[PDB]
mmCIF file of all heavy atoms in Angstrom:
data_model
loop_
_atom_site.group_PDB
_atom_site.id
_atom_site.type_symbol
_atom_site.label_atom_id
_atom_site.label_comp_id
_atom_site.label_asym_id
_atom_site.label_seq_id
_atom_site.Cartn_x
_atom_site.Cartn_y
_atom_site.Cartn_z
ATOM 1 N N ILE A 1 -16.788 -8.622 -4.024
ATOM 2 C CA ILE A 1 -16.992 -8.472 -2.590
ATOM 3 C C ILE A 1 -18.001 -7.357 -2.299
ATOM 4 O O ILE A 1 -18.269 -7.035 -1.142
ATOM 5 C CB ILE A 1 -15.611 -8.293 -1.880
ATOM 6 C CG1 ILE A 1 -14.685 -9.466 -2.222
ATOM 7 C CG2 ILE A 1 -15.735 -8.197 -0.353
ATOM 8 C CD1 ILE A 1 -15.318 -10.830 -1.964
ATOM 9 N N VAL A 2 -18.585 -6.774 -3.349
ATOM 10 C CA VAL A 2 -19.657 -5.814 -3.129
ATOM 11 C C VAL A 2 -20.890 -6.504 -2.550
ATOM 12 O O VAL A 2 -21.378 -7.497 -3.099
ATOM 13 C CB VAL A 2 -20.020 -5.075 -4.425
ATOM 14 C CG1 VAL A 2 -21.157 -4.096 -4.162
ATOM 15 C CG2 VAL A 2 -18.804 -4.322 -4.951
ATOM 16 N N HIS A 3 -21.364 -5.966 -1.429
ATOM 17 C CA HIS A 3 -22.549 -6.450 -0.719
ATOM 18 C C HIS A 3 -23.784 -5.713 -1.243
ATOM 19 O O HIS A 3 -23.670 -4.615 -1.799
ATOM 20 C CB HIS A 3 -22.335 -6.186 0.777
ATOM 21 C CG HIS A 3 -23.400 -6.730 1.679
ATOM 22 N ND1 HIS A 3 -24.527 -6.012 2.019
ATOM 23 C CD2 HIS A 3 -23.471 -7.893 2.370
ATOM 24 C CE1 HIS A 3 -25.260 -6.722 2.861
ATOM 25 N NE2 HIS A 3 -24.642 -7.868 3.091
ATOM 26 N N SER A 4 -24.964 -6.294 -1.036
ATOM 27 C CA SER A 4 -26.205 -5.639 -1.462
ATOM 28 C C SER A 4 -26.403 -4.242 -0.863
ATOM 29 O O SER A 4 -27.120 -3.410 -1.432
ATOM 30 C CB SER A 4 -27.402 -6.527 -1.123
ATOM 31 O OG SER A 4 -27.557 -6.598 0.281
ATOM 32 N N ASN A 5 -25.787 -3.952 0.277
ATOM 33 C CA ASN A 5 -25.940 -2.618 0.860
ATOM 34 C C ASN A 5 -24.997 -1.580 0.261
ATOM 35 O O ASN A 5 -25.000 -0.416 0.669
ATOM 36 C CB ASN A 5 -25.882 -2.630 2.391
ATOM 37 C CG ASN A 5 -24.491 -2.921 2.934
ATOM 38 O OD1 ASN A 5 -23.493 -2.814 2.223
ATOM 39 N ND2 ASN A 5 -24.423 -3.255 4.216
ATOM 40 N N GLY A 6 -24.196 -2.012 -0.708
ATOM 41 C CA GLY A 6 -23.313 -1.091 -1.420
ATOM 42 C C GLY A 6 -21.895 -1.032 -0.876
ATOM 43 O O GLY A 6 -21.007 -0.462 -1.524
ATOM 44 N N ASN A 7 -21.678 -1.579 0.317
ATOM 45 C CA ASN A 7 -20.333 -1.584 0.891
ATOM 46 C C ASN A 7 -19.561 -2.795 0.393
ATOM 47 O O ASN A 7 -20.145 -3.790 -0.016
ATOM 48 C CB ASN A 7 -20.377 -1.647 2.417
ATOM 49 C CG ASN A 7 -20.672 -0.308 3.051
ATOM 50 O OD1 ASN A 7 -20.185 0.727 2.597
ATOM 51 N ND2 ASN A 7 -21.435 -0.326 4.138
ATOM 52 N N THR A 8 -18.238 -2.689 0.431
ATOM 53 C CA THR A 8 -17.375 -3.805 0.052
ATOM 54 C C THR A 8 -16.584 -4.217 1.296
ATOM 55 O O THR A 8 -15.668 -3.512 1.717
ATOM 56 C CB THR A 8 -16.417 -3.365 -1.074
ATOM 57 O OG1 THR A 8 -17.177 -2.942 -2.219
ATOM 58 C CG2 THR A 8 -15.495 -4.498 -1.495
ATOM 59 N N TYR A 9 -16.980 -5.338 1.898
ATOM 60 C CA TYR A 9 -16.427 -5.763 3.181
ATOM 61 C C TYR A 9 -15.160 -6.595 3.026
ATOM 62 O O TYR A 9 -15.154 -7.822 3.205
ATOM 63 C CB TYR A 9 -17.493 -6.499 4.004
ATOM 64 C CG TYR A 9 -18.624 -5.578 4.408
ATOM 65 C CD1 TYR A 9 -19.856 -5.629 3.759
ATOM 66 C CD2 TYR A 9 -18.446 -4.620 5.399
ATOM 67 C CE1 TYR A 9 -20.882 -4.775 4.107
ATOM 68 C CE2 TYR A 9 -19.480 -3.758 5.765
ATOM 69 C CZ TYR A 9 -20.687 -3.836 5.094
ATOM 70 O OH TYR A 9 -21.730 -3.006 5.453
ATOM 71 N N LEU A 10 -14.094 -5.894 2.662
ATOM 72 C CA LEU A 10 -12.790 -6.476 2.463
ATOM 73 C C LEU A 10 -11.896 -5.919 3.554
ATOM 74 O O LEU A 10 -11.701 -4.706 3.655
ATOM 75 C CB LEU A 10 -12.254 -6.107 1.074
ATOM 76 C CG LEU A 10 -11.003 -6.986 1.078
ATOM 77 C CD1 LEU A 10 -11.110 -8.318 0.348
ATOM 78 C CD2 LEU A 10 -9.677 -6.333 1.074
ATOM 79 N N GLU A 11 -11.362 -6.814 4.374
ATOM 80 C CA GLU A 11 -10.521 -6.453 5.512
ATOM 81 C C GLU A 11 -9.120 -7.056 5.381
ATOM 82 O O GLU A 11 -8.943 -8.089 4.733
ATOM 83 C CB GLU A 11 -11.195 -6.953 6.794
ATOM 84 C CG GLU A 11 -12.511 -6.220 7.050
ATOM 85 C CD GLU A 11 -13.590 -7.030 7.760
ATOM 86 O OE1 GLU A 11 -13.267 -7.845 8.649
ATOM 87 O OE2 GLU A 11 -14.778 -6.830 7.401
ATOM 88 N N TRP A 12 -8.136 -6.402 5.991
ATOM 89 C CA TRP A 12 -6.775 -6.943 6.023
ATOM 90 C C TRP A 12 -6.326 -7.065 7.469
ATOM 91 O O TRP A 12 -6.537 -6.136 8.265
ATOM 92 C CB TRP A 12 -5.768 -6.039 5.305
ATOM 93 C CG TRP A 12 -5.883 -5.989 3.801
ATOM 94 C CD1 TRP A 12 -6.643 -5.117 3.066
ATOM 95 C CD2 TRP A 12 -5.234 -6.859 2.860
ATOM 96 N NE1 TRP A 12 -6.486 -5.378 1.721
ATOM 97 C CE2 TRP A 12 -5.635 -6.443 1.575
ATOM 98 C CE3 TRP A 12 -4.333 -7.924 2.982
ATOM 99 C CZ2 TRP A 12 -5.156 -7.061 0.402
ATOM 100 C CZ3 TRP A 12 -3.858 -8.541 1.814
ATOM 101 C CH2 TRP A 12 -4.284 -8.106 0.549
ATOM 102 N N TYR A 13 -5.701 -8.200 7.784
ATOM 103 C CA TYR A 13 -5.210 -8.550 9.128
ATOM 104 C C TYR A 13 -3.724 -8.899 9.062
ATOM 105 O O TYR A 13 -3.248 -9.425 8.052
ATOM 106 C CB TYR A 13 -5.985 -9.740 9.739
ATOM 107 C CG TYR A 13 -7.433 -9.400 9.945
ATOM 108 C CD1 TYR A 13 -8.370 -9.591 8.941
ATOM 109 C CD2 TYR A 13 -7.852 -8.815 11.140
ATOM 110 C CE1 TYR A 13 -9.706 -9.205 9.121
ATOM 111 C CE2 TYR A 13 -9.178 -8.439 11.323
ATOM 112 C CZ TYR A 13 -10.100 -8.625 10.316
ATOM 113 O OH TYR A 13 -11.406 -8.221 10.517
ATOM 114 N N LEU A 14 -2.998 -8.602 10.137
ATOM 115 C CA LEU A 14 -1.604 -8.994 10.284
ATOM 116 C C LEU A 14 -1.476 -9.912 11.486
ATOM 117 O O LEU A 14 -1.954 -9.571 12.562
ATOM 118 C CB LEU A 14 -0.711 -7.765 10.490
ATOM 119 C CG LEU A 14 0.732 -8.003 10.938
ATOM 120 C CD1 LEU A 14 1.503 -8.853 9.926
ATOM 121 C CD2 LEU A 14 1.384 -6.648 11.144
ATOM 122 N N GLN A 15 -0.847 -11.067 11.307
ATOM 123 C CA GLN A 15 -0.597 -11.956 12.427
ATOM 124 C C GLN A 15 0.902 -12.088 12.633
ATOM 125 O O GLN A 15 1.639 -12.496 11.730
ATOM 126 C CB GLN A 15 -1.199 -13.334 12.194
ATOM 127 C CG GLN A 15 -1.038 -14.229 13.429
ATOM 128 C CD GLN A 15 -1.951 -15.433 13.360
ATOM 129 O OE1 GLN A 15 -2.124 -16.006 12.290
ATOM 130 N NE2 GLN A 15 -2.544 -15.813 14.491
ATOM 131 N N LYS A 16 1.337 -11.709 13.830
ATOM 132 C CA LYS A 16 2.741 -11.822 14.197
ATOM 133 C C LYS A 16 2.925 -13.075 15.044
ATOM 134 O O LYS A 16 1.965 -13.587 15.629
ATOM 135 C CB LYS A 16 3.214 -10.546 14.905
ATOM 136 C CG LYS A 16 3.131 -9.324 13.996
ATOM 137 C CD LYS A 16 4.285 -8.351 14.163
ATOM 138 C CE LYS A 16 5.618 -9.078 14.266
ATOM 139 N NZ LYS A 16 6.736 -8.388 13.554
ATOM 140 N N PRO A 17 4.161 -13.602 15.078
ATOM 141 C CA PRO A 17 4.457 -14.779 15.880
ATOM 142 C C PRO A 17 4.001 -14.612 17.330
ATOM 143 O O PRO A 17 4.331 -13.618 17.981
ATOM 144 C CB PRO A 17 5.983 -14.879 15.795
ATOM 145 C CG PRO A 17 6.304 -14.271 14.469
ATOM 146 C CD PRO A 17 5.340 -13.127 14.331
ATOM 147 N N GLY A 18 3.214 -15.576 17.800
ATOM 148 C CA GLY A 18 2.715 -15.583 19.172
ATOM 149 C C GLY A 18 1.647 -14.549 19.478
ATOM 150 O O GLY A 18 1.439 -14.189 20.638
ATOM 151 N N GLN A 19 0.979 -14.047 18.442
ATOM 152 C CA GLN A 19 -0.091 -13.078 18.635
ATOM 153 C C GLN A 19 -1.359 -13.468 17.875
ATOM 154 O O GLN A 19 -1.328 -14.243 16.919
ATOM 155 C CB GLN A 19 0.349 -11.681 18.189
ATOM 156 C CG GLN A 19 1.634 -11.151 18.813
ATOM 157 C CD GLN A 19 1.411 -10.536 20.177
ATOM 158 O OE1 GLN A 19 0.975 -11.211 21.111
ATOM 159 N NE2 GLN A 19 1.717 -9.249 20.302
ATOM 160 N N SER A 20 -2.479 -12.941 18.348
ATOM 161 C CA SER A 20 -3.733 -13.040 17.615
ATOM 162 C C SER A 20 -3.645 -12.099 16.417
ATOM 163 O O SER A 20 -2.868 -11.142 16.433
ATOM 164 C CB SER A 20 -4.918 -12.644 18.499
ATOM 165 O OG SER A 20 -4.963 -13.422 19.688
ATOM 166 N N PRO A 21 -4.422 -12.381 15.359
ATOM 167 C CA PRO A 21 -4.389 -11.443 14.243
ATOM 168 C C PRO A 21 -4.845 -10.060 14.681
ATOM 169 O O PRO A 21 -5.660 -9.918 15.601
ATOM 170 C CB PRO A 21 -5.418 -12.033 13.280
ATOM 171 C CG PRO A 21 -5.437 -13.514 13.625
ATOM 172 C CD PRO A 21 -5.317 -13.524 15.093
ATOM 173 N N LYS A 22 -4.305 -9.038 14.026
ATOM 174 C CA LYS A 22 -4.686 -7.666 14.322
ATOM 175 C C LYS A 22 -5.209 -6.982 13.059
ATOM 176 O O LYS A 22 -4.672 -7.159 11.968
ATOM 177 C CB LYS A 22 -3.535 -6.892 14.972
ATOM 178 C CG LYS A 22 -2.439 -6.449 14.040
ATOM 179 C CD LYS A 22 -1.340 -5.706 14.812
ATOM 180 C CE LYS A 22 -0.805 -4.510 14.051
ATOM 181 N NZ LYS A 22 -0.125 -3.581 15.009
ATOM 182 N N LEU A 23 -6.284 -6.227 13.224
ATOM 183 C CA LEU A 23 -6.918 -5.492 12.128
ATOM 184 C C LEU A 23 -6.059 -4.345 11.615
ATOM 185 O O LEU A 23 -5.580 -3.529 12.410
ATOM 186 C CB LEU A 23 -8.264 -4.940 12.607
ATOM 187 C CG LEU A 23 -9.028 -4.099 11.580
ATOM 188 C CD1 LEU A 23 -9.456 -4.939 10.406
ATOM 189 C CD2 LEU A 23 -10.223 -3.515 12.271
ATOM 190 N N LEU A 24 -5.877 -4.284 10.299
ATOM 191 C CA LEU A 24 -5.196 -3.156 9.665
ATOM 192 C C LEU A 24 -6.151 -2.252 8.902
ATOM 193 O O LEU A 24 -6.101 -1.032 9.036
ATOM 194 C CB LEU A 24 -4.142 -3.654 8.673
ATOM 195 C CG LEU A 24 -3.042 -4.567 9.225
ATOM 196 C CD1 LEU A 24 -2.212 -5.115 8.075
ATOM 197 C CD2 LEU A 24 -2.129 -3.838 10.199
ATOM 198 N N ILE A 25 -6.950 -2.855 8.035
ATOM 199 C CA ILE A 25 -7.756 -2.110 7.082
ATOM 200 C C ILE A 25 -9.148 -2.727 7.027
ATOM 201 O O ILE A 25 -9.273 -3.947 7.046
ATOM 202 C CB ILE A 25 -7.158 -2.249 5.661
ATOM 203 C CG1 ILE A 25 -5.723 -1.736 5.582
ATOM 204 C CG2 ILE A 25 -8.046 -1.557 4.632
ATOM 205 C CD1 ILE A 25 -5.602 -0.251 5.738
ATOM 206 N N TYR A 26 -10.203 -1.917 6.938
ATOM 207 C CA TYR A 26 -11.552 -2.428 6.740
ATOM 208 C C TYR A 26 -12.218 -1.676 5.577
ATOM 209 O O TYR A 26 -11.774 -0.583 5.184
ATOM 210 C CB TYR A 26 -12.374 -2.305 8.032
ATOM 211 C CG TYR A 26 -12.569 -0.884 8.513
ATOM 212 C CD1 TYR A 26 -13.682 -0.142 8.127
ATOM 213 C CD2 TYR A 26 -11.640 -0.292 9.355
ATOM 214 C CE1 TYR A 26 -13.875 1.157 8.569
ATOM 215 C CE2 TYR A 26 -11.816 1.018 9.793
ATOM 216 C CZ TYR A 26 -12.936 1.731 9.405
ATOM 217 O OH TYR A 26 -13.076 3.030 9.844
ATOM 218 N N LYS A 27 -13.247 -2.292 5.015
ATOM 219 C CA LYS A 27 -13.934 -1.774 3.836
ATOM 220 C C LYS A 27 -12.948 -1.264 2.788
ATOM 221 O O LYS A 27 -13.013 -0.105 2.349
ATOM 222 C CB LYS A 27 -15.009 -0.740 4.198
ATOM 223 C CG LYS A 27 -16.274 -1.388 4.772
ATOM 224 C CD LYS A 27 -17.356 -0.372 5.142
ATOM 225 C CE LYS A 27 -16.895 0.680 6.127
ATOM 226 N NZ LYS A 27 -18.035 1.554 6.596
ATOM 227 N N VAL A 28 -12.025 -2.159 2.440
ATOM 228 C CA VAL A 28 -11.072 -1.989 1.351
ATOM 229 C C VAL A 28 -9.909 -1.064 1.684
ATOM 230 O O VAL A 28 -8.751 -1.430 1.491
ATOM 231 C CB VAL A 28 -11.725 -1.487 0.031
ATOM 232 C CG1 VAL A 28 -10.657 -1.424 -1.063
ATOM 233 C CG2 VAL A 28 -12.849 -2.414 -0.398
ATOM 234 N N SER A 29 -10.222 0.126 2.184
ATOM 235 C CA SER A 29 -9.223 1.191 2.217
ATOM 236 C C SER A 29 -9.263 2.072 3.457
ATOM 237 O O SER A 29 -8.563 3.074 3.514
ATOM 238 C CB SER A 29 -9.405 2.065 0.981
ATOM 239 O OG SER A 29 -10.742 2.515 0.944
ATOM 240 N N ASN A 30 -10.061 1.697 4.455
ATOM 241 C CA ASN A 30 -10.137 2.489 5.688
ATOM 242 C C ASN A 30 -9.170 1.935 6.705
ATOM 243 O O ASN A 30 -9.276 0.769 7.106
ATOM 244 C CB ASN A 30 -11.543 2.464 6.268
ATOM 245 C CG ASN A 30 -12.531 3.186 5.401
ATOM 246 O OD1 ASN A 30 -12.717 4.399 5.523
ATOM 247 N ND2 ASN A 30 -13.163 2.455 4.500
ATOM 248 N N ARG A 31 -8.209 2.749 7.115
ATOM 249 C CA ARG A 31 -7.205 2.315 8.066
ATOM 250 C C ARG A 31 -7.782 2.319 9.478
ATOM 251 O O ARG A 31 -8.406 3.294 9.900
ATOM 252 C CB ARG A 31 -6.022 3.277 7.962
ATOM 253 C CG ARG A 31 -4.757 2.774 8.599
ATOM 254 C CD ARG A 31 -3.555 3.596 8.156
ATOM 255 N NE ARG A 31 -3.558 4.943 8.733
ATOM 256 C CZ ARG A 31 -3.788 6.050 8.037
ATOM 257 N NH1 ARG A 31 -4.045 5.974 6.740
ATOM 258 N NH2 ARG A 31 -3.772 7.235 8.631
ATOM 259 N N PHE A 32 -7.574 1.242 10.228
ATOM 260 C CA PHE A 32 -8.098 1.160 11.583
ATOM 261 C C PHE A 32 -7.309 2.094 12.510
ATOM 262 O O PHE A 32 -6.123 2.301 12.315
ATOM 263 C CB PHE A 32 -8.071 -0.307 12.046
ATOM 264 C CG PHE A 32 -8.593 -0.528 13.437
ATOM 265 C CD1 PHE A 32 -9.876 -0.130 13.792
ATOM 266 C CD2 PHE A 32 -7.796 -1.121 14.397
ATOM 267 C CE1 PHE A 32 -10.360 -0.340 15.072
ATOM 268 C CE2 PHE A 32 -8.277 -1.337 15.688
ATOM 269 C CZ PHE A 32 -9.555 -0.927 16.018
ATOM 270 N N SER A 33 -7.992 2.704 13.478
ATOM 271 C CA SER A 33 -7.336 3.576 14.446
ATOM 272 C C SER A 33 -6.093 2.923 15.043
ATOM 273 O O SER A 33 -6.127 1.768 15.463
ATOM 274 C CB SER A 33 -8.325 3.941 15.553
ATOM 275 O OG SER A 33 -9.503 4.512 15.005
ATOM 276 N N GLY A 34 -4.985 3.668 15.068
ATOM 277 C CA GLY A 34 -3.744 3.154 15.623
ATOM 278 C C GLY A 34 -2.814 2.484 14.635
ATOM 279 O O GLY A 34 -1.638 2.276 14.920
ATOM 280 N N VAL A 35 -3.328 2.152 13.458
ATOM 281 C CA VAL A 35 -2.493 1.560 12.428
ATOM 282 C C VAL A 35 -1.690 2.659 11.737
ATOM 283 O O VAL A 35 -2.255 3.667 11.322
ATOM 284 C CB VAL A 35 -3.370 0.820 11.403
ATOM 285 C CG1 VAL A 35 -2.522 0.245 10.280
ATOM 286 C CG2 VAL A 35 -4.140 -0.306 12.098
ATOM 287 N N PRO A 36 -0.365 2.468 11.640
ATOM 288 C CA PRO A 36 0.512 3.456 11.017
ATOM 289 C C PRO A 36 0.113 3.795 9.578
ATOM 290 O O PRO A 36 -0.369 2.939 8.832
ATOM 291 C CB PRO A 36 1.894 2.778 11.067
ATOM 292 C CG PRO A 36 1.811 1.779 12.149
ATOM 293 C CD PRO A 36 0.378 1.304 12.152
ATOM 294 N N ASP A 37 0.338 5.041 9.183
ATOM 295 C CA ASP A 37 -0.076 5.550 7.887
ATOM 296 C C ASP A 37 0.723 4.999 6.710
ATOM 297 O O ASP A 37 0.419 5.295 5.558
ATOM 298 C CB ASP A 37 0.004 7.073 7.887
ATOM 299 C CG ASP A 37 1.376 7.561 8.287
ATOM 300 O OD1 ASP A 37 2.343 7.279 7.554
ATOM 301 O OD2 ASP A 37 1.486 8.184 9.366
ATOM 302 N N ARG A 38 1.754 4.204 6.982
ATOM 303 C CA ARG A 38 2.489 3.549 5.907
ATOM 304 C C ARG A 38 1.662 2.404 5.309
ATOM 305 O O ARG A 38 1.978 1.915 4.227
ATOM 306 C CB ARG A 38 3.863 3.054 6.386
ATOM 307 C CG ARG A 38 3.840 2.006 7.479
ATOM 308 C CD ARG A 38 5.262 1.577 7.874
ATOM 309 N NE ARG A 38 5.250 0.603 8.954
ATOM 310 C CZ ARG A 38 5.223 0.912 10.244
ATOM 311 N NH1 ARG A 38 5.222 2.186 10.627
ATOM 312 N NH2 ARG A 38 5.175 -0.050 11.151
#
């Protein structure tokens, strides 16, 4: 998943019943603002 610019664009999403997916993590290991530290 390494891109030519050197970044690795791997994201994680959580989808709960009756909701749109929500962003948890971007570029492998960066936690999105508001996502709990667990």
Side-chain angles (χ1 to χ4, degrees):
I1 304 308
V2 179
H3 185 271
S4 68
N5 71 17
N7 281 321
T8 300
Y9 294 104
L10 187 99
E11 294 149 36
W12 289 90
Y13 297 88
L14 168 60
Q15 185 164 39
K16 297 218 43 141
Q19 306 277 62
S20 304
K22 76 181 220 160
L23 178 66
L24 302 172
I25 301 291
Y26 62 92
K27 284 180 303 187
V28 183
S29 55
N30 292 273
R31 196 165 71 251
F32 180 57
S33 305
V35 177
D37 55 64
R38 62 180 178 273

